[PDB]
Amino acid sequence: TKGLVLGIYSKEKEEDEPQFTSAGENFNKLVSGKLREILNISGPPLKAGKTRTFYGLHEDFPSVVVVGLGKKTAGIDEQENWHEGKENIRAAVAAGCRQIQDLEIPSVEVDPCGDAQAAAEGAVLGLYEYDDLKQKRKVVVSAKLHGSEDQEAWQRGVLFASGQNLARRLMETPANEMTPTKFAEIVEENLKSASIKTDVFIRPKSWIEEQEMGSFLSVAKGSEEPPVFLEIHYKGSPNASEPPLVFVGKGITFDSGGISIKAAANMDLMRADMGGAATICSAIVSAAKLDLPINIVGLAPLCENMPSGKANKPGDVVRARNGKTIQVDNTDAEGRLILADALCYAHTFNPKVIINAATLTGAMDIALGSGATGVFTNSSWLWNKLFEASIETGDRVWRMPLFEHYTRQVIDCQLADVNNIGKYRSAGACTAAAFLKEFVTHPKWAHLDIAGVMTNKDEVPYLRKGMAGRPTRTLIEFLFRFSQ
Amino acid sequence: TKGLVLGIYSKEKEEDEPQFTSAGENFNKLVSGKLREILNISGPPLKAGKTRTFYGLHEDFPSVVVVGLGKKTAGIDEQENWHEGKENIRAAVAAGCRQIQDLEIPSVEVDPCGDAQAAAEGAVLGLYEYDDLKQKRKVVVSAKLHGSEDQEAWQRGVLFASGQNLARRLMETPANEMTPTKFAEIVEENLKSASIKTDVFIRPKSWIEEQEMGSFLSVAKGSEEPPVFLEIHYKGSPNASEPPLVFVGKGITFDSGGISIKAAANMDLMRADMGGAATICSAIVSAAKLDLPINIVGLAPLCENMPSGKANKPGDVVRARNGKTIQVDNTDAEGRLILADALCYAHTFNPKVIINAATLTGAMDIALGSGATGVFTNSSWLWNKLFEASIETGDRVWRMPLFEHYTRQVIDCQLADVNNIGKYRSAGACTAAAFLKEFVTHPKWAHLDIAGVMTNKDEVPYLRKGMAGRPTRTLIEFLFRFSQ
Amino acid sequence: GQNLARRLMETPANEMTPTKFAEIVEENLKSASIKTDVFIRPKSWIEEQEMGSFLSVAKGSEEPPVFLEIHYKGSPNASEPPLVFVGKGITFDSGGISIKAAANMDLMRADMGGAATICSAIVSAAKLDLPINIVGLAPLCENMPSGKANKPGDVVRARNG
Numbered sequence A, B: 001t002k003g004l005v006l007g008i009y010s011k012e013k014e015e016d017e018p019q020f021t022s023a024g025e026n027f028n029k030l031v032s033g034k035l036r037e038i039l040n041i042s043g044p045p046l047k048a049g050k051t052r053t054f055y056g057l058h059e060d061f062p063s064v065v066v067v068g069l070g071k072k073t074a075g076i077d078e079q080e081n082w083h084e085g086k087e088n089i090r091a092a093v094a095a096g097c098r099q100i101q102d103l104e105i106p107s108v109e110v111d112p113c114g115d116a117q118a119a120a121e122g123a124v125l126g127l128y129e130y131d132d133l134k135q136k137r138k139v140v141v142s143a144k145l146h147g148s149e150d151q152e153a154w155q156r157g158v159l160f161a162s163g164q165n166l167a168r169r170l171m172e173t174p175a176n177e178m179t180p181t182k183f184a185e186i187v188e189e190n191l192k193s194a195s196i197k198t199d200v201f202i203r204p205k206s207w208i209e210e211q212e213m214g215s216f217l218s219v220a221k222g223s224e225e226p227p228v229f230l231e232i233h234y235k236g237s238p239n240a241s242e243p244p245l246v247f248v249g250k251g252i253t254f255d256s257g258g259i260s261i262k263a264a265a266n267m268d269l270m271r272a273d274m275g276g277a278a279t280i281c282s283a284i285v286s287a288a289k290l291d292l293p294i295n296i297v298g299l300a301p302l303c304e305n306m307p308s309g310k311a312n313k314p315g316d317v318v319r320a321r322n323g324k325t326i327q328v329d330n331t332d333a334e335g336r337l338i339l340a341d342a343l344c345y346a347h348t349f350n351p352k353v354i355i356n357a358a359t360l361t362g363a364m365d366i367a368l369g370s371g372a373t374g375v376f377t378n379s380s381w382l383w384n385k386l387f388e389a390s391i392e393t394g395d396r397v398w399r400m401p402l403f404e405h406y407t408r409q410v411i412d413c414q415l416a417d418v419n420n421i422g423k424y425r426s427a428g429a430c431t432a433a434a435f436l437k438e439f440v441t442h443p444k445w446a447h448l449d450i451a452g453v454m455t456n457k458d459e460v461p462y463l464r465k466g467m468a469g470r471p472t473r474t475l476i477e478f479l480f481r482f483s484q
Numbered sequence C: 001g002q003n004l005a006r007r008l009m010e011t012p013a014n015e016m017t018p019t020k021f022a023e024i025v026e027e028n029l030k031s032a033s034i035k036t037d038v039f040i041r042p043k044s045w046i047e048e049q050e051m052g053s054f055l056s057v058a059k060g061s062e063e064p065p066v067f068l069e070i071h072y073k074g075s076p077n078a079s080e081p082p083l084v085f086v087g088k089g090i091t092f093d094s095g096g097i098s099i100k101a102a103a104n105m106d107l108m109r110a111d112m113g114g115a116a117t118i119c120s121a122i123v124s125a126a127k128l129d130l131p132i133n134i135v136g137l138a139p140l141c142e143n144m145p146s147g148k149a150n151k152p153g154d155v156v157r158a159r160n161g
């Protein structure tokens, strides 16, 4: 069995009938108008994101799925902050591919729909499913471009989507399999497979100790699982001495909260508390695959946050790499503790920019949910580059404030230089960002709180229910544009 | 007796000693150098917002309070989105006036500190206290400009500050006194006092019924306190037919939650659930006092949300003025219910702009706290005007997303056209804003969720602990600039 | 028959009041067969019957309570003993003074499901022209908090004493 996905646009006012894409009309012409005739017989027009299946139209394609693409000239929607045409394509193609898979068809050719990269993204992201640990699995589908004219664009989409899917795999995998060491080894193999101009160092606890990363170590000690500090280098610039861009990611492989233990309900989702590490590392792997002409460094402190007879205790005071003391009032505000040391270490590379990502606060989820990643930055130039990249990818970002108003609430501390939780519950994501800022002196730093976009139910049409791997594509796009 | 407040700046690198303002140096000369001498003897220099008191320097001023103003040329802070110099002045003058009041002095003269409007704002906002119901009260202080050169600017500051204090009084007053009827009567007397070019309509229940405002009526019926729909007009434009700007404010005089009853802790603060109505009505009163050349209409639905044998019941379906049905899944999401009807009615005036304010969600507090008012708008032009105005006033605003992503979660409704609570618990402020949007078709609409700025502890230096009346001055400034 | 029960249960409580429920059941039963009788008993009858337990629940709300009594006389022998069906008809359950939590309280509009299922079954039995006598009983009211609602610890007297 071989399937075919074809697109059709919504009818414009002066048109007599809705228009097929170039590929759609070519196929219609090939079958002497039978595609149009059957679509007409089937009833109401196909709206954006909807699908309909026609059988036996051609010997090579027993199953043809037509998908609605919406308005043909849909461009950048100033109200939604994204390119609507691309989002329509990703949604439609994903829907069409899911139908092909339900029919248990192993291979499908996909209409480029006027934007091969967007089409490929919808197909690859849409078909993804983490099922390594199940006996019963859906049929494996091999999606390929229909035609031979937009090969580069199609493959670019496959590459961007594959980067996001690696992130999703890492996030979804249960914590007993996805340990700090396993995560580091998987990232290592993918980066090396991407380019030979790479270096990876899986730093052990002894190195972490030598580096005086006391804040990170305090979180790790409660668990029996060994911690590691992942450091990756991609040497893409023609000039070896060119200052690198540095990415930092929160790698808590499992967050139980520690002594300040979490409630039971849905705690399983905390296996994805290493999402910041997953997204930044995956973006670097993709940049390496594309061979972007830039130097990039990735840093990811990795460990578990568990309760035991040697775990962090509320009230304990720990010393960060930069000498600042931190009062650990709540052991479950552990992300900011491991990031304090990683951010400090990031300055040693004399980077052009420092960008960190973390599933940092439940407050961010209460704030924006899965609508957009929250971005706190001291550089409007940096905010604008991230914003522009998100418009292209559809994986949106939204700016959040970095004000002294919030800093004041974390430096007001009984025992130390800074407290790991604010004096109030208000503005949880903002006080968390203020805490991170006390460990940053760089002029171009951006903190991405991705807690709200950790998962997908049905919000992003082209992602099945599960860990989302967002905003991997936005980081890749940012890197591509920066390199140009 | 009379007190005196004088300013001094932080010393600049090239300067030999910190410099007094023009008024401070004049006073020093008047007392033959005794002020500089005593300040030197007293020790460490005065930093921004700090104060020090000197006695017996002059027969007419037994107590002189010197206040730190910070850097003289501090202008717009690109990281904080406000004019820092003005904020420094407001804080310093407020601290100085509080010291004079603690000394029980009834009159104080205030140094204009290079910006008489900011000085007056610091004095008038800083001294304010709602103490009508207390037997023991602080001395009533009469603040006046030291000198006469900048009297016009001083008077302007007193006006802006008085507008905010009216909002504070309305918000702070207990609900058994500040009923829908009382609120309307106070606004009425203040508006007529401000200008004869005004009209006030205190609409009774019978009018609300004739207007088919079923959503608003459903919230009010649970209580025995009569509801009113306050409608005010300010006819400032030279052209009577010039389209007006319309303001709408949530007026819940007390929110117990109704059948979906609230928890007891701090429920007393719900007496300020009419803050949206207070801020927009006070801004209009001030605009009228300023004699701005524009037409403005203010709309404020007012009622209590109480449990009883005839109160809204979860699952009930009500019909809004536009004919759209609403499923009331949670009776405590009452603000969006009353606003639905007010927003529909706002369109009948064929306005240029529609701006509503409301203490709408606890989620907004979790999102940004008291750092800034959240602004949801379909117009980037409108966002920029509000943002620019906020830089001047110091009472900050921060943009929040108005995406279909959030709309989808409120139109997914079991029984009606729209549900009063989202399908999920994430992004509460965003889903609430989406709900409001279903009752708006205007191209220039802005929704201000002021729940997080309802109160002040000590975040804003120049406001004592209590209801804040934010962001009244930002609305007044927006109106002033719009008229120019 | 099942869909009628679904409609009654799904309809919001501000529309599906004790009075409205009784009126819908009435029109459907009379439509089903002429061998029927419908009694929409008011509060005064409930009081005469000394139904103190039922009355204690209803008083907290301003919505009038009713005791719905329906008969289907299908047996050839008029004196044949009937089968009696009884259904709980709480049109909305807020819990009263022992108030419920907010989450999903909207579903309590279906707390009259017992009344809906037995009354609809009787309507259907009548449509089928079954040769039996049947009586349906449905006490209907809301359970709301107020200044005159049932108070924990209160003692009430049922019809049997």
Ligand SMILES: CC(C)C[C@H](N)P(=O)(O)O
Binding pocket: A255, A257, A273, A332, A333, A334, A335, A359, A360, A361, A362, A451
């Ligand atoms: C819900 C989730 C994003 C919470 C963070 N892992 P925390 O417990 O470190 O705040």
Ligand SMILES: CC(C)C[C@H](N)P(=O)(O)O
Binding pocket: B255, B257, B273, B332, B333, B334, B335, B359, B360, B361, B362, B451
């Ligand atoms: C805390 C406060 C802002 C809650 C609103 N009054 P709601 O109960 O109407 O959401």
Ligand SMILES: [Zn+2]
Binding pocket: A170, A171, A172, A173, A174, A175, A178, A253, A271, A272, A274
């Ligand atoms: Zn995982």
Ligand SMILES: [Zn+2]
Binding pocket: A255, A257, A305, A331, A332, A333, A334, A335
């Ligand atoms: Zn945690």
Ligand SMILES: [Zn+2]
Binding pocket: A252, A255, A273, A332, A334, A335, A359, A360
């Ligand atoms: Zn965490």
Ligand SMILES: [Zn+2]
Binding pocket: B170, B171, B172, B173, B174, B175, B178, B253, B271, B272, B274
């Ligand atoms: Zn009040």
Ligand SMILES: [Zn+2]
Binding pocket: B255, B257, B305, B331, B332, B333, B334, B335
């Ligand atoms: Zn409420």
Ligand SMILES: [Zn+2]
Binding pocket: B252, B255, B273, B332, B334, B335, B359, B360
């Ligand atoms: Zn409210």
Ligand SMILES: [Zn+2]
Binding pocket: C008, C009, C010, C011, C012, C013, C016, C091, C109, C110, C112
């Ligand atoms: Zn019902």
